[PDB]
Design a protein around this nucleic acid. Structure first.
Ligand SMILES: [Mg+2]
Ligand SMILES: [Mg+2]
Ligand SMILES: [Mg+2]
Length: 91
RNA sequence: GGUCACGCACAGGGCAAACCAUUCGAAAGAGUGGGACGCAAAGCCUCCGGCCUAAACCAUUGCACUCCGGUAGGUAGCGGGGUUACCGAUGG
């Protein structure tokens, strides 16, 4: 169940990619070092974000701390990622 | 000479990237002036593919790590295709 990556759902789609990453970064750095923040404004990936943490305990901490946090008008819907990939476990 | 091509020239020359100033645009970018990296159509046209933008509207609650909604705008100096044209190697 737990993961290095957290899947943030239900984001304000009107925000630019530039600012969205920057804001999420300013929000989620409180919990540990972030490897990357993936954000895409494609039809399939709109209103979604992946924060990849250095540590899983950091991810668990951020999820449990900021569930339903009012963020650009809307509460974030955080849940662990299904699979991590990137540069986590070999791939 | 005309036509279809061709660019190893000749001659008249033409256009003008980056950058800068300025204007319009939400942006990509375009216009004008300066300026030349290049260009045998770097004249012109978004019909076909690519790539860039995303303010508005419509749709989407979507689990990605190749990249991708509609819509609209841009690139003709990203290809293709359409169309117009100067010179003419005893030129093919
Ligand atoms: Mg960080
Ligand atoms: Mg000029
Ligand atoms: Mg045009």
């Amino acid at each position: 169940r737990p993961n290095h990556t957290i899947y943030i759902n239900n984001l304000n789609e009107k925000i630019k990619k530039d600012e969205l990453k920057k804001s999420l970064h300013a929000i989620f750095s409180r919990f540990g070092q972030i490897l990357d923040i993936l954000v895409s404004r494609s039809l399939k990936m709109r209103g979604q974000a992946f924060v990849i943490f250095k540590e899983v305990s950091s991810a668990t901490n951020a999820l449990r701390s900021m569930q339903g946090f009012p963020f650009y008008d809307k509460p974030m819907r955080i849940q662990y990622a299904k699979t991590d990939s990137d540069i986590i476990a070999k791939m």
